[PDB]
Curated annotation (Swiss-Prot), chains A, B:
Its cofactor is pyridoxal 5'-phosphate; Zn(2+). InterPro entries: Ala_racemase_N, D-amino_acid_metab_enzyme, D-ser_dehydrat-like_dom, D-ser_dehydrat-like_sf, PLP-binding_barrel. It is found in: Cytoplasm; Cell projection, Dendrite. The gene is DSD. This is D-serine dehydratase.
Amino acid sequence: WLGALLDTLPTPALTIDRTTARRNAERMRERCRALGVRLRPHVKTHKTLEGGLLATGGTRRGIAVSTLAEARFFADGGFDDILLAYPVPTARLEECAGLARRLDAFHVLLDRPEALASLRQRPLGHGKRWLVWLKLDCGNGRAGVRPTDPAALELAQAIANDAPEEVTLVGVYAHCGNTYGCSGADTIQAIARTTTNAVLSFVAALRQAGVPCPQASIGSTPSCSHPIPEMSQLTELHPGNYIFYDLQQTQLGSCQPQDVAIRVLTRVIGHYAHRGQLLVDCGWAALSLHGAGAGPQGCAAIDGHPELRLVGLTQEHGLLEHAGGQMDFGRFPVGSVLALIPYHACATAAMHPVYYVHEEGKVVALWHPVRGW
Amino acid sequence: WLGALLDTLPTPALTIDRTTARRNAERMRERCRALGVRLRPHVKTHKTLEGGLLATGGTRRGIAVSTLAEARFFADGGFDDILLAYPVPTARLEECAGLARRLDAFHVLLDRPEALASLRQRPLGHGKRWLVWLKLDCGNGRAGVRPTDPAALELAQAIANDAPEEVTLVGVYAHCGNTYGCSGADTIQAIARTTTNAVLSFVAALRQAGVPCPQASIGSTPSCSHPIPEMSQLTELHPGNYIFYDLQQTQLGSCQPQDVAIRVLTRVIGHYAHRGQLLVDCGWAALSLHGAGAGPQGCAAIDGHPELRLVGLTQEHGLLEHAGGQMDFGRFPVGSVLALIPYHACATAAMHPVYYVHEEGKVVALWHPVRGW
Ligand SMILES: Cc1ncc(COP(=O)(O)O)c(CNC[C@@H](N)C(=O)O)c1O
Ligand SMILES: Cc1ncc(COP(=O)(O)O)c(CNC[C@@H](N)C(=O)O)c1O
Ligand SMILES: [Cl-]
Ligand SMILES: [Zn+2]
Ligand SMILES: [Zn+2]
């Protein structure tokens, strides 16, 4: 479809503005340069080699992934310095070890002594150590050890020193995912600040105890979009969603509408005057239901038409009302193309086997994401 | 993974009990035989050749699909008598016509004179007619013409008689999707009855007007699971979800827990005592958020453990509480496998590139679904 005009694509179609995405990627890289920290982009928003190449500024080095299928896909694509940003899967250690042996640098995360115990009973060998990060829970309420829990310091000690030829402690890793529960720069920054200070305190505690911890990593798209100076005391930031942004991030204050690279293109396929509704060929199969539970009106906005809203999604159909009761079927003929702005980029992207990547109205590339586990 | 024990699979893993699914398929076929009607299973719940083969009782004939990608996939798989159960996509008529020419019987649906007009300006040729069904709106509130709207009868007349060598009216098609908004057999049957009687009335109206309409088709999984005798006056039923069922259908009363063929297997990957939570390796990427907006507690139940409930899903993590405040970490060690029963089979299945199909504890096949548009 290279060269094709967007309104020519078969819908529903996930489109990515390459100019916007390139810009988002370069901006995050510059924020990190200004802070003096490295950027380790998380790839789970797009799951593509091409997106990885952009986020990484062409180097193919320094990413985080959320599954072993991503790890393998990006490894096969020539990436390295790959962090599996997930409690290391002790049931699949053979797969992890295969990656650790193929890659110059494959990093894993853990937060349980039994997980460290599992790594010990499956040595890598071959002059390779498990490159282990300690996952810190700093308010996220998910995985990781609490920085004020004595268990944390001891686990860090165990990872760093207890078998230095089989296992090394690369650093601590926190994810301030809680920034999603609060709107406005001020609250986002407070969470960033709490998380940053918790990490810094923990690292200071480690250095006082003699536990070598060379790296410290936090990041979420909301906090990395408006960074605080305290972040220059860390070594690495690992946001991911920012490469695309979405309506959720626009509502949070992370970005402006112009920063959202992603749309789902859909065609009007029906008028129903007796109901006041347009029928479009985008249902939850192209969109997901993210944004609904917090109904369908929250799943997407119609780009350039605030008057319209979603009022129904089935697997392959969506219903649009003017919810001014004042619909104008003449302005939206059957066959015309609307651009939906989805609530959650990661969720929408996971529904598409292909992304139509465009510049100035025309398709310039096709990106095909990996999926699965 | 053939022969493998289920607890051996890499999680999260979508599993289908082949004995349950075979049973569901044969039961629906028998209901239809008892009624004297044909079964045209909709394949969108599973989107696999293998599921199509079961639903179809081995014949590979008589299905409904929801997209041109399904149409093509099932055509390439040797199926025929395929109905595209969707307003015919007038922007992609070349694709439709390619299928109409390759297949003995490719059926399309419409509900707009302009859509019929579009079919006329793109004749099939080669001794082939567009095989057109009229979509009826009988309370569903989606697509189709209302049976009491004079426009319906005229469109049916136009399809049947206005260009009999280019276009034929195969029948009327209704989908009682509204059965999803009401629990209990009685209300489900009322909707089935309203829909059936509306269709029958419309067909009687057609015969009085001299419009040949040989087929009449309704169906949804809730109404076809407890059919009414009035349905024997139709010619065809087209449910789809019943091949798997799910928690939603169990709550509606369509099926019993034993009829649900589908699970998502997930591993406990973490204990968090200070929160009372288990961490499992199934997030929304393996589950979808269906069942949430009507929070996460509604997305799935843990098979054999009513005590547990979901309280959080991120892309790749889920959180389980005992919500008796009384968790018992000893009964759920890290590494153990739980079976989630998802809310909406179709939504969950759309998240998986492979289904692990098993009999008596062991994997017997891998089904790979098509996706996209
Ligand atoms: C047009 C059409 N025909 C048949 C079916 C099968 O219904 P069941 O899922 O078996 O009850 C459907 C499916 N219905 C609803 C979907 N559009 C959805 O939103 O999930 C159908 O649409
Ligand atoms: C462990 C881990 N590290 C980094 C990120 C990137 O965060 P952003 O999406 O860019 O804000 C994540 C992602 N977070 C939340 C997901 N688990 C989800 O539920 O969507 C992460 O998990
Ligand atoms: Cl969803
Ligand atoms: Zn996300
Ligand atoms: Zn469904």
